[PDB]
Design a protein around this ligand. Sequence first.
Ligand SMILES: C[C@H](NC(=O)c1ccccc1Cl)c1nnc(SCCOc2ccc(F)cc2)n1C
Ligand SMILES: C[C@H](NC(=O)c1ccccc1Cl)c1nnc(SCCOc2ccc(F)cc2)n1C
Lengths: 306, 306
Amino acid sequence: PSPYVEFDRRQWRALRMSTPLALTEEELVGLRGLGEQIDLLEVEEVYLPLARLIHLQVAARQRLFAATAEFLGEPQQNPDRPVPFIIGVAGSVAVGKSTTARVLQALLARWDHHPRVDLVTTDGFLYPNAELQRRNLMHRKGFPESYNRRALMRFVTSVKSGSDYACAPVYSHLHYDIIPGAEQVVRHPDILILEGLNVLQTGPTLMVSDLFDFSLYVDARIEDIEQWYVSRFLAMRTTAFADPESHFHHYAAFSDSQAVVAAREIWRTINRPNLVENILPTRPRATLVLRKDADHSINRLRLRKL
Amino acid sequence: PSPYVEFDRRQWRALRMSTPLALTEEELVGLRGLGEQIDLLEVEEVYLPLARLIHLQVAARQRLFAATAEFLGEPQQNPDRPVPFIIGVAGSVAVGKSTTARVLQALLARWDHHPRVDLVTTDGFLYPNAELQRRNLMHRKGFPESYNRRALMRFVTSVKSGSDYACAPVYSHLHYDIIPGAEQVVRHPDILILEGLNVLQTGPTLMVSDLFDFSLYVDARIEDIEQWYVSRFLAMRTTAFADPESHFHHYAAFSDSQAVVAAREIWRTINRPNLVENILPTRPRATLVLRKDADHSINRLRLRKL
Ligand SMILES: C[C@H](NC(=O)c1ccccc1Cl)c1nnc(SCCOc2ccc(F)cc2)n1C
Ligand SMILES: C[C@H](NC(=O)c1ccccc1Cl)c1nnc(SCCOc2ccc(F)cc2)n1C
């Protein structure tokens, strides 16, 4: 016995799933602009059922708010509307948290119950490079201490407080740094998806996950994430690294053979460590673990028994 | 800018609760049974609405389970019933956690949605004074490491796994130790309350709070809890301390003056520090904070905005 209900891809395909849920032509090729590492199959066959499943929780949490308000007799101090339902997304660098996160925002915004759905990345809560350096933490970017955990708690707390506004800084992957003065504004969305390596990490007191209504962990065999890591790094040689303004411009010149050694090394000494010490252990804290194949196909879903 | 809805005693009484709630004849005879001097006005004026609030959430969870199970097409590997709804109850030693848990237990069971409510104290998961001696831990009974956490976790995991059967040890306050062979059994109650100092404390990975659906933190000013603590101690001279077998027999002969000194020193050195260091920081992790006045009456409810 286990606290999980477990499905594999076969079992997931045997769908007696009681609603069609009609994916229109527009969104079905608009769900292209955000991925490459998602078939339209995966969307139709997995992500769409998942988002239905989350809908039921968002909807239920909205009814509960109301039935509570009307029970308290709609007092002055109680808010008018439910607070933002907040979804955490966790997993290793290279696992596709951003993509999964972008697919969910896309799908979940489709119901009328919750049409406004924001997406925030904890990237923007890394300490600026000045700070990391002042703190001797450059070698540890991505590690828990590498973030302003307090600012991040203030932000999420402010959002779960039903604030009309709340903003988070913006990180730049091209410049490998926080963009100065740059800020995303969150405006009491219906649902906020919060994505980052760290979102399900533990703390001595309150932690961001205490404010999550639901959370996902994107999982894969560790060799398979390494394989995606490398390939993204070689591809960046063309894109991000090519740009002369990139912190890692000098990495563009490297040949396939050379960039692979460099990548396996950055993995081996930074990112694989972070994964093993700090990300993996948060795995069983998620409402839903999604394991992926070598080929980026969900082979296993683990859902918290209700 | 707060995540809490906040009532005081006045405000709470005054609320118009548009379904009348009243206790039968018949229900007040039993709440005199656990009648540790406990104010029945308060039971009716506070804990009973408090308990309806919580019923509303039990009921939401049950209906969500149904919705989820239906949307899935009732697959075999899904449980056919909601797994137990788990409620934590945390706070200092001497704060009334158990009395609070005991009343909630009793009040929550009146609904036909969840008549089967169980109550387990984390005390039974303390290490025997035997095993505690081996660790040099006797000076820290009721600090985090004084507990068998793997065991606590396995136990709460099994109940939450929707299991038919799960056993917990039993602690004796009379003998200051775990009663060997003694065990409490839980057979998948509709609702399990889990009472104890440590229930909302944080671990590095999956932790018991990760499995709670609601949690209460029973709170009061520090000086007041000392007062109740001391009183309790003196008051135990007459009772459990009198037995010439009980581990604290000797204390049943200290004069008021002597026993107050000893109690204050025991607080000042073990329990007040345990409160400041390990119990008090878990307070914001609770869905509901109930604060008490010097005279044991509730004067503040902070509930988490839904
Ligand atoms: C250790 C460092 N970590 C990060 O940049 C980072 C930190 C927090 C969150 C996300 C990231 Cl990607 C890093 N990891 N790989 C590199 S090479 C520069 C960026 O290259 C890649 C390569 C492959 C990826 F999947 C993502 C980024 N670097 C500088
Ligand atoms: C350090 C110890 N703490 C506990 O036994 C304990 C541990 C976990 C849960 C509850 C308790 Cl009371 C303790 N605290 N006070 C004492 S004196 C004997 C027990 O008497 C009391 C007095 C007052 C109380 F509120 C509770 C117990 N002792 C031995």
